[PDB]
Amino acid sequence: TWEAWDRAIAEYAXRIEXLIXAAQEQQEKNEXALXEL
Amino acid sequence: TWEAWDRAIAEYAXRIEXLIXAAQEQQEKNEXALXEL
Amino acid sequence: TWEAWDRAIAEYAXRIEXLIXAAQEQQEKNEXALXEL
Amino acid sequence: SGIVQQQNNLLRAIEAQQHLLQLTVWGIKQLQARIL
Amino acid sequence: SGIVQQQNNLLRAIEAQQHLLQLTVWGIKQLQARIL
Amino acid sequence: SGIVQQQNNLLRAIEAQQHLLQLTVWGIKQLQARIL
């Protein structure tokens, strides 16, 4: 179905927009580690 | 509208193809810094 | 045509899913180099 | 400082694809609805 | 250890766009077929 | 040398998504036009 797909996209676009959370919040440790050095 | 969207995509796909400018032109500082080391 | 496009997408989505091969298999050298250090 | 400023530029580009991916999807949904 | 764990998080995000890009395309192909 | 050669491989992959994102959009535009 198309609402199976709308749901399956939205959740997936959730996972990505989770990863880019994890990433964005390293980048701002890295921009902490860079503070010291 | 759809030409509102065509315009709003194209500009956005501009920003990205700006970032990937900024990035591509670090990668080739990094590939300069790597020259030394 | 649309099968010109289906083919031209699939091959391209091949190249990417080749790069993300190359990348995934650095990330797991990096996660080897990180072993030592 | 440049590499970190850059991983940031990769991160940045990906975020911009994320908005562009959602825009393509909007288009698709408008076509789904109009054409069905 | 964090940066490597992160490049991994970029790599990870890209892989997730790859699956999302293929999903948009499926939609497109269903519209191509229905509307032609 | 490998990590830099790799950030390059991320950069590379993103560029390839950019071309694939534009291709999906072409499809969408052909459907917009045909179906309206």
Coordinates of C-alpha atoms in Angstrom, one line a residue:
Chain A
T1 CA 0.0 0.0 0.0
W2 CA 0.9 3.7 -0.1
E3 CA 0.2 4.3 3.6
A4 CA 2.4 1.4 4.3
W5 CA 5.1 3.3 2.3
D6 CA 4.3 6.7 3.8
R7 CA 4.7 5.1 7.2
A8 CA 7.8 3.2 6.1
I9 CA 9.4 6.4 4.7
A10 CA 8.6 8.6 7.7
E11 CA 10.2 6.1 10.1
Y12 CA 13.2 5.9 7.9
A13 CA 13.6 9.5 7.3
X14 CA 13.3 9.2 12.1
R15 CA 16.3 6.8 11.8
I16 CA 18.2 9.3 9.7
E17 CA 17.1 12.5 11.3
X18 CA 18.6 9.7 15.1
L19 CA 21.9 9.3 13.2
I20 CA 22.3 12.9 12.1
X21 CA 21.4 13.3 16.8
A22 CA 24.4 11.0 17.2
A23 CA 26.5 12.7 14.5
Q24 CA 25.6 16.4 15.2
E25 CA 26.1 15.8 19.0
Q26 CA 30.0 14.0 18.1
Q27 CA 30.6 17.1 16.0
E28 CA 29.9 19.5 18.7
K29 CA 32.7 16.6 21.3
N30 CA 35.0 17.3 18.4
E31 CA 34.4 21.1 18.2
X32 CA 35.2 20.2 23.1
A33 CA 38.3 18.2 22.0
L34 CA 39.3 21.1 19.7
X35 CA 38.7 23.7 23.3
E36 CA 41.9 21.7 24.5
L37 CA 43.9 21.5 21.3
Chain B
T1 CA 2.3 25.3 -6.4
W2 CA 4.6 23.1 -8.4
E3 CA 6.8 25.9 -9.7
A4 CA 7.1 27.1 -6.1
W5 CA 8.4 23.6 -5.5
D6 CA 10.6 23.4 -8.6
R7 CA 12.2 26.7 -7.5
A8 CA 12.4 25.6 -3.9
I9 CA 14.1 22.3 -4.9
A10 CA 16.6 23.8 -7.3
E11 CA 17.8 26.4 -4.8
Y12 CA 18.1 23.7 -2.2
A13 CA 19.8 21.2 -4.5
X14 CA 22.4 25.3 -5.0
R15 CA 22.9 25.1 -1.2
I16 CA 24.0 21.5 -1.3
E17 CA 25.9 21.5 -4.6
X18 CA 27.7 25.4 -1.9
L19 CA 28.4 22.9 0.8
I20 CA 29.8 20.0 -1.3
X21 CA 32.3 23.8 -2.8
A22 CA 33.2 24.1 0.9
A23 CA 33.8 20.5 1.5
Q24 CA 35.5 19.5 -1.8
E25 CA 37.8 22.6 -1.5
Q26 CA 38.8 21.3 2.6
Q27 CA 39.4 17.9 1.1
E28 CA 41.8 19.1 -1.4
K29 CA 43.6 21.5 2.2
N30 CA 43.6 18.0 3.7
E31 CA 45.0 16.2 0.6
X32 CA 48.1 20.2 1.2
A33 CA 48.3 19.2 4.9
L34 CA 48.9 15.5 3.9
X35 CA 52.1 17.3 1.3
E36 CA 53.8 18.0 4.7
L37 CA 52.9 14.9 6.7
Chain C
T1 CA 12.6 6.9 -22.0
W2 CA 11.6 5.6 -18.5
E3 CA 13.5 2.3 -18.9
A4 CA 16.5 4.4 -19.9
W5 CA 16.0 6.2 -16.5
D6 CA 15.3 3.0 -14.5
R7 CA 18.6 1.6 -15.9
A8 CA 20.4 5.0 -15.4
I9 CA 19.2 5.2 -11.8
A10 CA 19.9 1.6 -10.8
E11 CA 23.5 1.8 -12.1
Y12 CA 23.9 5.0 -10.2
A13 CA 22.3 3.8 -7.0
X14 CA 25.7 0.5 -8.0
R15 CA 28.2 3.3 -8.0
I16 CA 27.0 4.6 -4.7
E17 CA 26.2 1.4 -3.0
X18 CA 30.8 0.8 -4.7
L19 CA 31.6 4.0 -2.8
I20 CA 29.8 3.2 0.4
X21 CA 32.3 -0.8 -0.3
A22 CA 35.3 1.6 -0.4
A23 CA 34.1 3.7 2.6
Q24 CA 32.7 0.9 4.8
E25 CA 35.8 -1.2 4.2
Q26 CA 38.3 2.3 5.3
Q27 CA 36.0 2.5 8.4
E28 CA 36.5 -1.0 9.4
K29 CA 41.1 0.0 8.6
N30 CA 40.2 2.9 10.9
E31 CA 38.3 0.9 13.5
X32 CA 42.5 -1.7 12.8
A33 CA 44.5 1.6 13.2
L34 CA 42.3 2.3 16.4
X35 CA 43.6 -1.8 17.6
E36 CA 47.0 -0.1 17.9
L37 CA 46.2 3.3 19.3
Chain D
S1 CA 40.7 22.6 12.9
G2 CA 39.9 22.4 9.2
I3 CA 39.0 18.6 9.1
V4 CA 36.5 19.0 12.1
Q5 CA 35.2 22.2 10.4
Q6 CA 34.8 19.8 7.4
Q7 CA 33.3 16.7 8.8
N8 CA 30.9 19.4 9.8
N9 CA 30.6 20.3 6.1
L10 CA 29.7 16.7 5.3
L11 CA 27.3 16.6 8.2
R12 CA 25.9 19.9 6.8
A13 CA 25.5 18.5 3.3
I14 CA 23.7 15.4 4.5
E15 CA 21.3 17.5 6.4
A16 CA 20.6 19.4 3.3
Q17 CA 20.0 16.2 1.4
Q18 CA 17.6 15.2 4.1
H19 CA 15.5 18.3 3.4
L20 CA 15.8 17.7 -0.3
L21 CA 14.7 14.0 0.2
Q22 CA 11.6 15.1 2.1
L23 CA 10.8 17.6 -0.7
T24 CA 11.0 14.9 -3.4
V25 CA 8.7 12.8 -1.2
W26 CA 6.2 15.7 -0.9
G27 CA 6.1 15.8 -4.7
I28 CA 5.5 12.1 -4.8
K29 CA 2.7 12.3 -2.3
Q30 CA 1.0 15.0 -4.4
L31 CA 1.2 12.8 -7.4
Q32 CA -0.1 9.8 -5.5
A33 CA -3.1 11.8 -4.3
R34 CA -3.8 13.6 -7.6
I35 CA -3.3 10.4 -9.6
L36 CA -5.3 8.3 -7.2
Chain E
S1 CA 37.9 7.0 19.2
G2 CA 34.9 9.4 18.9
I3 CA 35.7 10.9 15.4
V4 CA 36.1 7.4 13.9
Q5 CA 33.0 6.3 15.7
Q6 CA 31.5 9.3 14.0
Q7 CA 32.7 9.1 10.5
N8 CA 30.9 5.9 11.0
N9 CA 27.8 7.9 12.0
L10 CA 28.1 9.8 8.7
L11 CA 28.7 6.6 6.8
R12 CA 25.7 5.3 8.7
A13 CA 23.5 8.2 7.8
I14 CA 24.4 8.0 4.1
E15 CA 23.4 4.4 4.0
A16 CA 20.1 5.4 5.5
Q17 CA 19.7 7.9 2.7
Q18 CA 20.5 5.3 0.2
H19 CA 17.5 3.2 1.5
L20 CA 15.3 6.3 1.6
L21 CA 16.4 7.2 -2.0
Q22 CA 15.4 3.8 -3.2
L23 CA 12.1 4.1 -1.5
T24 CA 11.3 7.4 -3.2
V25 CA 12.2 5.8 -6.5
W26 CA 9.8 2.9 -5.8
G27 CA 7.1 5.5 -5.3
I28 CA 8.0 7.1 -8.6
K29 CA 8.0 3.8 -10.4
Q30 CA 4.5 3.1 -9.1
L31 CA 3.3 6.4 -10.4
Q32 CA 5.0 5.9 -13.7
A33 CA 3.2 2.5 -14.1
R34 CA -0.2 3.7 -12.8
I35 CA -0.1 6.9 -14.7
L36 CA 1.2 5.2 -17.9
Chain F
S1 CA 46.4 9.0 4.5
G2 CA 43.5 6.5 4.6
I3 CA 41.0 8.6 6.6
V4 CA 41.5 11.6 4.3
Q5 CA 41.3 9.2 1.3
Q6 CA 38.0 8.3 3.0
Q7 CA 36.4 11.5 4.0
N8 CA 36.9 11.8 0.3
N9 CA 34.9 8.5 -0.1
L10 CA 32.1 10.1 1.9
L11 CA 32.3 13.3 0.0
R12 CA 32.3 11.1 -3.1
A13 CA 29.2 9.1 -2.0
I14 CA 27.3 12.4 -1.3
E15 CA 28.0 13.7 -4.7
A16 CA 26.6 10.5 -6.1
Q17 CA 23.5 11.0 -4.0
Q18 CA 23.2 14.4 -5.3
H19 CA 23.1 13.1 -8.9
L20 CA 20.7 10.4 -7.9
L21 CA 18.5 13.0 -6.0
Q22 CA 18.3 15.1 -9.2
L23 CA 17.4 12.0 -11.2
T24 CA 14.5 11.2 -8.9
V25 CA 13.3 14.8 -9.3
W26 CA 13.4 14.5 -13.1
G27 CA 11.1 11.5 -12.8
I28 CA 8.8 13.5 -10.5
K29 CA 8.7 16.4 -12.9
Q30 CA 7.8 14.1 -15.8
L31 CA 4.9 12.8 -13.8
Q32 CA 3.8 16.2 -12.7
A33 CA 3.7 17.3 -16.4
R34 CA 2.1 14.1 -17.8
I35 CA -0.4 13.9 -14.9
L36 CA -1.2 17.6 -15.1

